[PDB]
Amino acid sequence: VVFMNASQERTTGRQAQISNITAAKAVADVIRTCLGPKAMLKMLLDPMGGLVLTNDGHAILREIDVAHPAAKSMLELSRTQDEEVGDGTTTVIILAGEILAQCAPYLIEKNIHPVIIIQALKKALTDALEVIKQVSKPVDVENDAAMKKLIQASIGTKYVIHWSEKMCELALDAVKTVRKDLNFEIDIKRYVRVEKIPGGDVLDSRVLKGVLLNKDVVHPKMSRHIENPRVVLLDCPLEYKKGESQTNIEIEKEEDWNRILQIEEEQVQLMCEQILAVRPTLVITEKGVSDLAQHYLLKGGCSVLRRVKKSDNNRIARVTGATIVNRVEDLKESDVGTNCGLFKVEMIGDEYFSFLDNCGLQKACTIMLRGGSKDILNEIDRNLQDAMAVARNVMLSPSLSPGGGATEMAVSVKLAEKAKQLEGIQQWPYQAVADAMECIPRTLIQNAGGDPIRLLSQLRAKHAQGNFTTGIDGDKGKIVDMVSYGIWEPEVIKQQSVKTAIESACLLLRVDDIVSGVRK
Amino acid sequence: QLFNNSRSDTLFLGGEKISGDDIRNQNVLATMAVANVVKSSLGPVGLDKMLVDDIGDFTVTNDGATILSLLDVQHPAGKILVELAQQQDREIGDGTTSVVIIASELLKRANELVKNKIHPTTIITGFRVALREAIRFINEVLSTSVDTLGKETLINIAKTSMSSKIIGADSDFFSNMVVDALLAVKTQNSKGEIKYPVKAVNVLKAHGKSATESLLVPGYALNCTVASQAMPKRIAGGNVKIACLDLNLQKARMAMGVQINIDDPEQLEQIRKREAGIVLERVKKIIDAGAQVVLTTKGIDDLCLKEFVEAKIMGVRRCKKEDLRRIARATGATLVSSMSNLEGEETFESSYLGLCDEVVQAKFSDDECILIKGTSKHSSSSIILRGANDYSLDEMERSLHDSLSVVKRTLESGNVVPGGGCVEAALNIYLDNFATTVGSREQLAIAEFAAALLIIPKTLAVNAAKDSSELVAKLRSYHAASQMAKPEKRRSYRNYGLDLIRGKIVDEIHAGVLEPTISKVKSLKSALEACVAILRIDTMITVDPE
Amino acid sequence: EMGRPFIIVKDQGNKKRQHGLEAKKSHILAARSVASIIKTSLGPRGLDKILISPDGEITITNDGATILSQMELDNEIAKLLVQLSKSQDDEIGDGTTGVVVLASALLDQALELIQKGIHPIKIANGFDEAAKLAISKLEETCDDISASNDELFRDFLLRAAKTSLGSKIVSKDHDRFAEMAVEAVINVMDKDRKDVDFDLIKMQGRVGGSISDSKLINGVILDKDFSHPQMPKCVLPKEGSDGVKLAILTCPFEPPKPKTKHKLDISSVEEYQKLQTYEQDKFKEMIDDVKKAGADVVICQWGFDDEANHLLLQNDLPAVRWVGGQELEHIAISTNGRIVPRFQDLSKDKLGTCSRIYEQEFGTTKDRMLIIEQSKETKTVTCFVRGSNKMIVDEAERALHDSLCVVRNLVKDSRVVYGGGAAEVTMSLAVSEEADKQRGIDQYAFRGFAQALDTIPMTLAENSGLDPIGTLSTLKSKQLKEKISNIGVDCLGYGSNDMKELFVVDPFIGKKQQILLATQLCRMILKIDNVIISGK
Amino acid sequence: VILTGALLGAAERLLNKGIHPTIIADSFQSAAKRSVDILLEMCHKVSL
Amino acid sequence: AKQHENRLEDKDLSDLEELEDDEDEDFLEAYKIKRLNEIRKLQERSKFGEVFHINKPEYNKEVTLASQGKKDDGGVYVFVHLSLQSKLQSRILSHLFQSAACKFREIKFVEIPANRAIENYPESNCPTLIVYYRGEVIKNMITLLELGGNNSKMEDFEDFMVKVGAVAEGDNRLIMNRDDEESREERKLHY
Numbered sequence A: 001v002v003f004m005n006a007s008q009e010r011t012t013g014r015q016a017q018i019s020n021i022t023a024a025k026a027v028a029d030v031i032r033t034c035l036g037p038k039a040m041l042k043m044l045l046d047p048m049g050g051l052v053l054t055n056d057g058h059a060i061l062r063e064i065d066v067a068h069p070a071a072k073s074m075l076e077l078s079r080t081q082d083e084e085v086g087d088g089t090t091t092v093i094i095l096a097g098e099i100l101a102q103c104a105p106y107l108i109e110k111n112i113h114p115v116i117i118i119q120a121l122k123k124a125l126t127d128a129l130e131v132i133k134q135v136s137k138p139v140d141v142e143n144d145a146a147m148k149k150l151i152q153a154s155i156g157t158k159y160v161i162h163w164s165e166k167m168c169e170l171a172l173d174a175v176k177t178v179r180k181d182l183n184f185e186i187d188i189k190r191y192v193r194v195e196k197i198p199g200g201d202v203l204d205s206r207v208l209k210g211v212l213l214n215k216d217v218v219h220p221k222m223s224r225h226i227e228n229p230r231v232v233l234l235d236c237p238l239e240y241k242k243g244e245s246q247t248n249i250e251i252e253k254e255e256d257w258n259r260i261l262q263i264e265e266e267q268v269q270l271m272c273e274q275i276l277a278v279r280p281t282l283v284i285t286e287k288g289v290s291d292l293a294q295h296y297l298l299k300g301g302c303s304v305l306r307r308v309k310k311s312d313n314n315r316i317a318r319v320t321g322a323t324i325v326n327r328v329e330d331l332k333e334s335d336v337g338t339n340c341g342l343f344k345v346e347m348i349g350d351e352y353f354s355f356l357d358n359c360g361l362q363k364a365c366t367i368m369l370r371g372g373s374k375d376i377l378n379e380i381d382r383n384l385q386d387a388m389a390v391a392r393n394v395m396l397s398p399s400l401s402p403g404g405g406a407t408e409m410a411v412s413v414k415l416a417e418k419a420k421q422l423e424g425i426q427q428w429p430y431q432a433v434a435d436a437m438e439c440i441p442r443t444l445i446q447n448a449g450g451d452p453i454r455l456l457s458q459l460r461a462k463h464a465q466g467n468f469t470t471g472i473d474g475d476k477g478k479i480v481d482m483v484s485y486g487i488w489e490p491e492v493i494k495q496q497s498v499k500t501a502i503e504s505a506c507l508l509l510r511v512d513d514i515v516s517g518v519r520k
Numbered sequence B: 001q002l003f004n005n006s007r008s009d010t011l012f013l014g015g016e017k018i019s020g021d022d023i024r025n026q027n028v029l030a031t032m033a034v035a036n037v038v039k040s041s042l043g044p045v046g047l048d049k050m051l052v053d054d055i056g057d058f059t060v061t062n063d064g065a066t067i068l069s070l071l072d073v074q075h076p077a078g079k080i081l082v083e084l085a086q087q088q089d090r091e092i093g094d095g096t097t098s099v100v101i102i103a104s105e106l107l108k109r110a111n112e113l114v115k116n117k118i119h120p121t122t123i124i125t126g127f128r129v130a131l132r133e134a135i136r137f138i139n140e141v142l143s144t145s146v147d148t149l150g151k152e153t154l155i156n157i158a159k160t161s162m163s164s165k166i167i168g169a170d171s172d173f174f175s176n177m178v179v180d181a182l183l184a185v186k187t188q189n190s191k192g193e194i195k196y197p198v199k200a201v202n203v204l205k206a207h208g209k210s211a212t213e214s215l216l217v218p219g220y221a222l223n224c225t226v227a228s229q230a231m232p233k234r235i236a237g238g239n240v241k242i243a244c245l246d247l248n249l250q251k252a253r254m255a256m257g258v259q260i261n262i263d264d265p266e267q268l269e270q271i272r273k274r275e276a277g278i279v280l281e282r283v284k285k286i287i288d289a290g291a292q293v294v295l296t297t298k299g300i301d302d303l304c305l306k307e308f309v310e311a312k313i314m315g316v317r318r319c320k321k322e323d324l325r326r327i328a329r330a331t332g333a334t335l336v337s338s339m340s341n342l343e344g345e346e347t348f349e350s351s352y353l354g355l356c357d358e359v360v361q362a363k364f365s366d367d368e369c370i371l372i373k374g375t376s377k378h379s380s381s382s383i384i385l386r387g388a389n390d391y392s393l394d395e396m397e398r399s400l401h402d403s404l405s406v407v408k409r410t411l412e413s414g415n416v417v418p419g420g421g422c423v424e425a426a427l428n429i430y431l432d433n434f435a436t437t438v439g440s441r442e443q444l445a446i447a448e449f450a451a452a453l454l455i456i457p458k459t460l461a462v463n464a465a466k467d468s469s470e471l472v473a474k475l476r477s478y479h480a481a482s483q484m485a486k487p488e489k490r491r492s493y494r495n496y497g498l499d500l501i502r503g504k505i506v507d508e509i510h511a512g513v514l515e516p517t518i519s520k521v522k523s524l525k526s527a528l529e530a531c532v533a534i535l536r537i538d539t540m541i542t543v544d545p546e
Numbered sequence C: 001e002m003g004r005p006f007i008i009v010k011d012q013g014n015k016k017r018q019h020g021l022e023a024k025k026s027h028i029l030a031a032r033s034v035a036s037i038i039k040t041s042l043g044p045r046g047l048d049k050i051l052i053s054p055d056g057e058i059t060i061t062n063d064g065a066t067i068l069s070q071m072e073l074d075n076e077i078a079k080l081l082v083q084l085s086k087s088q089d090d091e092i093g094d095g096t097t098g099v100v101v102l103a104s105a106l107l108d109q110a111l112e113l114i115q116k117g118i119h120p121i122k123i124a125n126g127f128d129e130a131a132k133l134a135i136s137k138l139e140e141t142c143d144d145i146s147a148s149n150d151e152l153f154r155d156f157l158l159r160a161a162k163t164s165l166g167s168k169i170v171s172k173d174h175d176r177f178a179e180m181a182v183e184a185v186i187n188v189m190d191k192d193r194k195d196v197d198f199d200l201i202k203m204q205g206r207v208g209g210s211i212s213d214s215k216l217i218n219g220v221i222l223d224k225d226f227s228h229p230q231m232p233k234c235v236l237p238k239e240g241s242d243g244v245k246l247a248i249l250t251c252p253f254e255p256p257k258p259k260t261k262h263k264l265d266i267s268s269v270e271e272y273q274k275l276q277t278y279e280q281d282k283f284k285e286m287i288d289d290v291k292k293a294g295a296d297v298v299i300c301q302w303g304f305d306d307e308a309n310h311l312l313l314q315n316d317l318p319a320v321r322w323v324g325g326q327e328l329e330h331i332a333i334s335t336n337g338r339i340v341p342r343f344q345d346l347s348k349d350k351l352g353t354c355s356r357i358y359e360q361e362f363g364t365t366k367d368r369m370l371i372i373e374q375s376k377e378t379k380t381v382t383c384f385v386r387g388s389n390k391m392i393v394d395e396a397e398r399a400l401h402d403s404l405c406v407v408r409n410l411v412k413d414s415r416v417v418y419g420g421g422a423a424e425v426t427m428s429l430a431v432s433e434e435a436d437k438q439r440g441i442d443q444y445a446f447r448g449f450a451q452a453l454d455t456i457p458m459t460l461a462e463n464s465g466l467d468p469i470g471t472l473s474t475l476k477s478k479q480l481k482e483k484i485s486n487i488g489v490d491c492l493g494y495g496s497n498d499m500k501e502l503f504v505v506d507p508f509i510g511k512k513q514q515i516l517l518a519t520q521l522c523r524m525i526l527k528i529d530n531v532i533i534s535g536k
Numbered sequence D: 001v002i003l004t005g006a007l008l009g010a011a012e013r014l015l016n017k018g019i020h021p022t023i024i025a026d027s028f029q030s031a032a033k034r035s036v037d038i039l040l041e042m043c044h045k046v047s048l
Numbered sequence E: 001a002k003q004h005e006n007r008l009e010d011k012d013l014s015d016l017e018e019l020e021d022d023e024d025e026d027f028l029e030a031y032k033i034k035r036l037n038e039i040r041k042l043q044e045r046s047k048f049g050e051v052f053h054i055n056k057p058e059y060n061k062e063v064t065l066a067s068q069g070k071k072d073d074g075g076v077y078v079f080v081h082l083s084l085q086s087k088l089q090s091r092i093l094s095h096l097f098q099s100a101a102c103k104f105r106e107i108k109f110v111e112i113p114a115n116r117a118i119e120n121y122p123e124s125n126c127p128t129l130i131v132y133y134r135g136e137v138i139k140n141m142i143t144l145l146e147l148g149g150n151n152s153k154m155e156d157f158e159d160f161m162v163k164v165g166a167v168a169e170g171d172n173r174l175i176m177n178r179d180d181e182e183s184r185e186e187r188k189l190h191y
């Protein structure tokens, strides 16, 4: 006579909120030192055994299973921030924790209702987007020299700041290739390929506009160096396709069995003759290839590569402009790809690699990263994802804002001036939003090794004079303006941070009871 | 309660036997045990809850419809309130939290009447005469839907359904969204009767900017991915034709139990060709019709994708049945299960194709959605909700889905009444004077029925963490003068309720909160029919499983 | 519950409860389970029952108290019936079996009235008014026997003695047990025929012999032999003397020593020889004291050593050892002697007097049991009951004990009533007559008690094998035809429902005690609503 | 189901009164057969 | 752990003085006051010390009732001896009562003839040793074949008193624990 198979007992009242807010503080503590240029690294032991060395916020949270359900709302914010932008994931977690940490002693102390706080955060969020729009400014998007320092901003936290001169050119040429004209920048990360090659040196690299395949030719007579290749994409297998009808043959005469295998040879003969109707030089197929079909293609020099993935065939199509056609009858000269060149197979003892290069504005490329271990290849690969993620927003919108705690301090100073001017019941939680933006500058200072009490005290008086571009240096900890150094980020990262931080606080502040035992 | 009773003393039953007022008390505690989780979720001051499935997965929910459905209760007296929450979600779509609290208090307040040796048959009769007297009073106190020169109604109706949600602060922005959505997806049936199909609009689980910047689509949005990446994503120009197919387009075998058998091996390749050719003849005539966009319920094989990529046709696989009826209804096309006609020949006519102005595929946080806008024959609408994660959007999805049902009822029935416990407090003053007229034992039943109705405005103040008796006493004072209004408007002291954000009694018409009267009607009958089901039980017979 | 452990009383899950109508059905059926045991036992045609104790010993009894006493029960309702039979057994000693079937008869008739919806207090008040009304009527109709002389008063004890012996085994030799039971009270009685002392007559059984060998002897039973059996077994008195001059002593034959621990120090050989002289002179002075006192038989409480055997044998003085203090209380009252503490206070006036002392074997090797007999009437009678089995002689003890208790009730003046089912039916028809004008709400309450009293005649009809309806119809019609109310159910088959003819008599105090304990317990059981019982 | 238990309660006390069960059984069949004839006189006919 | 407990537990009031120089005063004097109080309780309980030769009437007077003692459940063990001068083991057991009485003054030692003990007792079953405590019989012991018979010694009798709960195991008066001074002298030299 329990009346409930799912937590007949209840944890209600204020104790559930202590468990919620304290859990929201704990997820921020394990990544508090993961901000700024002097940030440390972390290691995670997954149960499968694949280790990873990460400092980005999204990779930390997704590989950590958490038993607390209220904490999991904080775990998913970096997932939301990752798929939306792909940069600034760590700031969303600590900012959401400071909002929840600062709003903690109001239900305990003041006994102010949560729904009044919900109204306070929306007006603060409305004013937060207003002052961020005032602090932001436009810049020229076509200046390649200007784009290098903006990509260098997010790279400065990561390990590859030492190769920032190479990484900016590596990412700037790649994002411009997939870019096209038509939200005015409809290019997508899915078209950009990044193949991880263990070994080599990271200094030696280049942006090759092509599709890097990880297999060898099927027959040894084929020439591995073609001057003017002609790409033709196919979905049909060169093998004999088995019918799904399960056809059985009643053989009575003696010549029927010999004629069937001759029709098998005649079908592959007629099928290969239609490939040579447009005389290609390079053929690609996503299915198997019989040994019978290899001989007939030697006379034409049609290099074949088999078991190619479905996504790689689409990437081959956009580079060379070839159309994917299943049947072999519909091959035309327009179907054959053109404007391709520099087909060469470099011999490496691990695996065989084949390059491609060009001479329907959609394009693609393959960034070949060289390193020392597979785990740091994932680090540099994730930095490439962060390298192009910061570049999309400056190309999408020309708007741009400073960073390094200066833009967050400008929100706190403007809110603090109007917080005393409001003079109402909602002004108490309205002040918590102004105090919540101080964690980021503080975090940066603390990691740098400075004394945050006096560095931030003069920073308050500095911003009171009427300037906004004054930040905090990460190495030595000056109050120097960021115009000299060049720390600048897009506006979309800070907009998504304050929006996701406010929207996450509204989700978690309106919880009073915790239950379990449902087993859906 | 105290101890367990004797197990089948000279009765010889395999299960348990219990009788008397003990099980009647257990039903009261059973209805109160399941109602306590619904107490804190009532009104705008209520807070949400989360249910953990012991697998890491959790879901945030405010309404008691799906909360009690997820809470697996084994006591059968509590199952009726579980089904009552599911019943009220189907017909009305709002007030699932209120019927559980009202039904529990009617049983709780009637528990005192049981030990007074008042029979339950007399108690429910006193409740039922109070019910039909309350329905007529609700039919008298209802107001018209004009109220001014302009409409000024549907924006206020959304605030009542949108209250007590995570996006209640953003209800000012979403109020214009829901009224513009349901006015676009209207239809015509029964020779002049207008209907509003709930769930016809597409609620997408998007992630990004915020709930405030949620863009209302002027048209339907299909949630599906493109087949191939080499296809054109954006199709401009007016009069874009929409083809809605459902037949099997991938290469399939012969009839369900036949066997292909042939003696001559010369025609073995020809039968293979025509099986590959007969499926392409269907794609050939669609290109002759010139359909820019084609949608299919079943899959799409690569043999068909080459023709769409060449002719620049947008082929989309993995559509669902319920969606394509709304695409054909909105774009003006007709659902095509197979290509045939009354004649023996097989062909395709251009009349089967729809029309729309623009079709664009958009991607936002790993969510590809085909935005179809500008339907010529009939309009459509979709709402792209944006938030933190999928589990937070489930509360927003239920918040929007309940909002459509409330705005559906105020248009189907223009009669409305104010919120804030106005009618719940007005019926008490009406029933107290009626309780004295009837005389005999039903006075206590009608009186305690009226006392149970006050729990709705009381719970608004208890959850607000404020003084409740002062607000109830002031609400009692104004409603007490309404019956003694002395007509000759100057009929004041009516249509008032609680204002929780400020803690005062003001006019609900000016505050901008209303609710349809039909929700009050069905909630009272369904709450009393559930109360009749629990009161009439005397003894339980629980048989153990074999 | 609200999830927390909702516990109030210690050991919550062990104990249970029971309320409503189901609590009552557990009570009435529990009484019917005990009533079926007693219903087939009551009356002269009853049957005994074997009660096996945990220690393996058995007792063949057909008395309700001894049955219920040795019965291991769990239900509390039967445990109150165990004490009700024990209550009737301790004070009156008659009707134990009745107070169970009669209380169950009130409970069985109360079950039908609970179905009608009568409150239990109105049921209990109805039996209280009906019980006093029946006692007030039966006190008027019974006749007094004090006007008759002593010769006829002895016959009234024989009427009740044969009534009490019968229905028990010991119903063969019952004509002699009636004379033996009456002869025991003729010796032990007050001159005013009032407040006789029952403690003077103790029960004593002997395993052996047959029932015919039992006889009357006025004396004490000791389970021991004389000291050093070389003397003759049967000692006789002198030629001219008042008696054997019995002597009793609570001092062992030894030198006088302090009661406190002592240390007699002998520091010289001359003092050591005086200790030898002191040792011998005390035994010499001791036997000279009892010699000059004229005692023949000596009774010692705390025994003595072997030195006094030869001194007592030469002077022709039998003696015993290890006589318990309870037996000396019985010896002094029987022989009318005073127990001297020591030899210095020894005088001829304190010695008792009895006829003769002798011992027999009763068989081969069992034990030598001492026998004493008086030559005249004394204030002590010890029944000498024999038996072929240990269960026979054990049942004969409690059977004869109830016989003396029934005669003890008749010692009280003006308490006689003719039983045999006549007392039940004569109290039943008047209660139904009162209900006809005292209807009220309690009209069915009087009818229940009227029908409950008649069950004991119907119980006698079942054991005798006669038709119950024809029996009660004839008795009820005969009581309405004639106001003579001494006709009852005769089951022993001598013909004649009349009864004074059949020499049967019950005590009046015993019969009114039946409905009192039955009604007083029924008032208690009907008050119970909640039944809380804990696990063992 | 209530009249059956009531007649069994009537037969409960009658078993103690030295009456055979078959005589008790036949008495109810004769009494029930007479009960039908009494109600046939009391019941009133109605129209179609 | 036991090394700290052996300083106080394994030393009497006479042996605790040896640790006056090594151990702390407050640590040592705190336990000496405890052991001194225990010694005072045994002196108050020493209401006996010689064989109580009783008569049969007194058998209740001094045995069963005495075993109740204070009835603080101040029980007292009462060893009764059904003596018989003819048997060999009886005079042996009588000597053990005299020796044990001088040592264990809190335990009451009682003796009585077997002929004056039980009505016609079997002489073959003599000597008999009964142990009363709070009115209840703790041990009804049979002739001394269990305790060696004719070769019974004082060490075997003291071991029996420990089994019935009359004397503690680690009592300094028992010969098993009361090591000779020459034994402890050799241990200190070879240490």
Ligand SMILES: Nc1ncnc2c1ncn2[C@@H]1O[C@H](COP(=O)(O)OP(=O)(O)O)[C@@H](O)[C@H]1O
Residues within 6 Å of the ligand: A034, A035, A036, A037, A057, A087, A088, A089, A090, A091, A092, A153, A154, A155, A156, A157, A158, A403, A404, A405, A472, A473, A474, A475, A487, A489
């Ligand atoms: N050398 C530096 N001096 C000042 N500020 C820095 C420096 N390096 C990084 N920052 C600040 O730290 C932030 C780190 O951003 P990033 O590492 O891309 O994501 P996250 O903020 O989630 O760690 C930047 O927004 C930038 O303003």
Ligand SMILES: Nc1ncnc2c1ncn2[C@@H]1O[C@H](COP(=O)(O)OP(=O)(O)O)[C@@H](O)[C@H]1O
Residues within 6 Å of the ligand: B041, B042, B043, B044, B062, B063, B094, B095, B096, B097, B098, B159, B160, B161, B162, B163, B164, B402, B418, B419, B420, B421, B497, B498, B499, B500, B513
């Ligand atoms: N702004 C408001 N002011 C006063 N009362 C309100 C307000 N919004 C809702 N209510 C009250 O809350 C009650 C139930 O609200 P409802 O929207 O059904 O909650 P839920 O969406 O959780 O079911 C209504 O009866 C109404 O009177």
Ligand SMILES: Nc1ncnc2c1ncn2[C@@H]1O[C@H](COP(=O)(O)OP(=O)(O)O)[C@@H](O)[C@H]1O
Residues within 6 Å of the ligand: C041, C042, C043, C044, C062, C063, C064, C093, C094, C095, C096, C097, C098, C162, C163, C164, C166, C167, C168, C419, C420, C421, C489, C490, C491, C492, C504, C506
């Ligand atoms: N010889 C007899 N003749 C007629 N009736 C007898 C005889 N002996 C006993 N009775 C009746 O039997 C009834 C039950 O007596 P019984 O049960 O034997 O005594 P108790 O209840 O003391 O054991 C009494 O009411 C008594 O009148």
Ligand SMILES: [Mg+2]
Residues within 6 Å of the ligand: A087, A088, A089, A090, A154, A386
């Ligand atoms: Mg970053």
Ligand SMILES: [Mg+2]
Residues within 6 Å of the ligand: B094, B095, B160, B161, B162, B402
């Ligand atoms: Mg609602």
Ligand SMILES: [Mg+2]
Residues within 6 Å of the ligand: C094, C095, C163, C164, C167
């Ligand atoms: Mg009798």
